């Protein structure tokens, strides 16, 4: 055909033993060979070649295949062929075969994924997350961290309450870290500024040094904040 080779990213003799479709469609062997055999030179075709062994052997299913895993060679496949299409090739040969080099490759492989799922490939697509995600059992639980993501807020005294919670929070129903307070008249505004802003100045009679004073913010805050990240001072009532 000559695409010359769109993207000449091998030097290694490929030859492939059978194919199917994964969940979408089906790649159709000639359709593999040519979809890289084009993209780079390498051959099922006659090669008496024995002078050094980079014959990479890709395959979906086995049967007729057998007789050479049952002779030591490691099958590794395919995807890795299709996944090399994605970006470039030095896709460090990660879990995808029928070969098994038990004590010596499925062992050397896992070195090149991480603890849970992804290779250190070019990882991810927002789908590829949900891929190795809906798959789990090991998970080392909570604790402390000091750099975040796109979901964070910190503890206080539902709608307002849960908008804290719905996204990285704590909450927790006594004297702590923050106060969002429910607005308006003698009632929320005044009786929530209650005496209960006064029920803070018992701490001082108590605690020897100044019981640290938290910041106090219109619920208003949470929202006008939730909408990017967080400010505080320009925000009373």
């Amino acid at each position: 055909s000559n695409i010359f080779a769109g993207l000449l990213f091998y030097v290694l003799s490929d030859y492939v033993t059978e194919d199917t479709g994964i969940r979408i469609t089906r790649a159709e062997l000639e359709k593999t060979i040519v979809e890289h055999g084009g993209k780079l030179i390498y051959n099922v075709i006659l090669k008496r070649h024995s002078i050094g062994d980079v014959r990479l052997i890709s395959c979906k299913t086995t049967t007729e295949c057998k007789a050479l895993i049952d002779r030591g060679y490691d099958i590794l496949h395919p995807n890795w062929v299709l996944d090399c299409i994605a970006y470039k090739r030095l896709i460090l040969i990660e879990p995808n075969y029928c070969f098994n080099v038990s004590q010596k490759m499925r062992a050397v492989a896992e070195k090149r994924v991480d603890c849970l799922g992804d290779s250190f490939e070019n990882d991810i697509s927002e789908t590829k997350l949900s891929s190795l995600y809906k798959s789990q059992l090991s998970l080392p639980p909570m604790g402390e961290l000091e750099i975040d993501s796109e979901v964070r807020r910190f503890p206080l005294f539902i709608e307002m309450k849960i908008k804290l919670f719905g996204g990285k929070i704590t909450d927790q129903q006594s004297l702590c870290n923050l106060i969002i307070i429910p607005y308006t008249d003698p009632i929320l505004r005044k009786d929530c500024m209650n005496e209960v802003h006064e029920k803070i100045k018992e701490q001082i009679k108590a605690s020897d040094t100044i019981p640290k004073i938290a910041r106090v913010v219109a619920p208003e805050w949470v929202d006008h904040s939730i909408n990017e990240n967080c400010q505080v001072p320009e925000e009373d009532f």
Binding site: F120, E121, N122, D123, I124, S125, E126, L129, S149, E150, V151, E159, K163, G166, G167, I226
Partner: protein
């Protein structure tokens, strides 16, 4: 009749158990109102942010990964 006024005594249940339907045809609609208008424009929407959260990760977890391959590929 001194049998009339009984009816001139509906004013009770059939005016008060009615002044009752009120706060039950009001307040119990009013919640189903609130209780929905709330979440049906909350729950599923902050979760627009479950979507924002991904890309951050993606666009800025592949951040970390690149900065392996560079490393890993300056070595013998």
């Amino acid at each position: 009749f001194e049998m009339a006024d009984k009816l001139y005594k509906d004013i009770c249940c059939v005016n008060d158990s009615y002044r009752n339907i009120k706060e039950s045809d009001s307040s119990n609609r009013n919640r189903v109102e609130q209780l929905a208008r709330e979440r049906e424009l909350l729950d599923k929407l902050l979760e627009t942010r479950d979507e924002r959260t991904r890309a951050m990760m993606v666009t800025l977890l592949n951040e970390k990964k690149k900065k392996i391959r560079e490393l890993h590929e300056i070595l013998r």
